[PDB]
Amino acid sequence: VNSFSGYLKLTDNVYIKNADIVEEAKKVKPTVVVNAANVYLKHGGGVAGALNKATNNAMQVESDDYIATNGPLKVGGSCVLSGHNLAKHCLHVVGPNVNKGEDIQLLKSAYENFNQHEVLLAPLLSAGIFGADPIHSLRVCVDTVRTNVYLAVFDKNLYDKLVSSFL
Ligand SMILES: O=C(Nc1ccc(C(=O)N[C@@H]2c3cccc(O)c3C[C@@H]2C(=O)O)c2scnc12)NC1CC1
């Protein structure tokens, strides 16, 4: 039993809710919240900008030190950093950004990072300002992630479309 509430069950291990991931993290304080990161951990907009704003920029400060030490992530890769006031840990995962021409096949590699964590609160990777089709992202999630994932979808209209079209 866990504290995630109001989710629709899509499969054995994947759950979905119309929710603001920031507000959901604040309320649940999950072990892991996933950030929709870029390789530079520059949390300017989208989910990343919102998560970072909710940490009062502490996520960005920590991220800048990480990059200065380690260099950029790979597209499809991830790193574990602090969850600050939102979660125990933040798993920063880089999905391909279609508006940069990155290969969408890398989306499966990106979701594979979730399998290193037993339970996660997450957005749909490569959705929103990353330019991918969210219906496709949900399909890859379901077909790749084997651990327990709670997906927060900000847009109510998109949430309803994702549920109604789910196979
Ligand atoms: O801003 C947040 N939280 C989140 C921000 C961005 C996102 C995000 O990238 N969503 C995508 C998006 C955005 C726009 C059009 C779209 O078709 C899609 C597909 C995805 C979706 O619809 O979910 C999310 S997902 C849960 N939470 C947040 N909190 C602050 C109080 C405002």
Q: What is the DSSP string of 74-127?
A: PTT-EEEEE-TTT-SEEEEE----GGGT--TTHHHHHHHGGGGSSEEEEPPTT-
Way the structure was solved = X-ray
User: Which residue among 154, 155, 159, 161 has the greatest number of ligand 1 atoms within 8 angstroms of its CB, and so is best to mutate?
Assistant: 154
Q: Which two structure tokens, joined as six digits, stand for 49? A: 């900008």
CA of 124, closest atom in ligand 1 = 20
The amino acid sitting at 148 is N
Please tell me the distance from the alpha carbon of residue 88 to that of residue 81, in angstroms, as a whole number. Answer: 9
Q: Which residues pair with 103 in a beta bridge?
A: none
Please tell me the distance from the alpha carbon of residue 25 to that of residue 23, in angstroms, as a whole number. Answer: 5
Please tell me the distance from the alpha carbon of residue 94 to that of residue 91, in angstroms, as a whole number. Answer: 10
Contact 95 CB / ligand 1 (< 6 Å):
no
Q: Which two structure tokens, joined as six digits, stand for 111? A: 């979701």
Of all protein residues, whose CA lies closest to atom 30 belonging to ligand 1?
50
* Residue 86 vs residues 4, 26, 32, 57: alpha-carbon distances, Å: 14, 5, 9, 12
Question: Phi and psi for 153 in degrees, rounded to 5?
Answer: -115, 115
Beta-carbon count within 10 A of 34 CB:
32
- The enclosing H or E element of 35 equals strand 32-36
Contact 133 CB / ligand 1 (< 6 Å):
no
Q: Which domains, from first to last, does the chain contain?
A: 8-165 (3.40.220.10)
Q: Are the beta carbons of 21 and 50 closer than 8 angstroms?
A: yes
3-state secondary structure (DSSP) of residue 36: strand
* Residue 72 vs residues 21, 36, 56, 68, 103: alpha-carbon distances, Å: 25, 15, 23, 9, 18
Residues 6+ apart with CB under 8 A from 25: 33, 51, 54, 83, 86, 87, 121
- Ligand 1 centre to CA of 64 (Å) is 23
Outline where 13-84 has alpha helix (H): 21-28, 46-54, 58-70
Residues 6+ apart with CB under 8 A from 34: 90, 91, 92, 93, 114, 120, 121, 122, 123, 125
- Ligand 1 centre to CA of 128 (Å) is 6
- The enclosing H or E element of 153 equals strand 148-153
Residues 6+ apart with CB under 8 A from 104: 96, 98, 126, 132, 136
For residue 115, which of 2, 1, 5, 14 has the smallest C-alpha distance? 14
Contact 47 CB / ligand 1 (< 6 Å):
yes
- Ligand 1 centre to CA of 150 (Å) is 14
Q: Cα torsion for 111, 121, 60, 137, to the nearest 10°? A: 40
Contact 53 CB / ligand 1 (< 6 Å):
no
- Ligand 1 centre to CA of 18 (Å) is 10
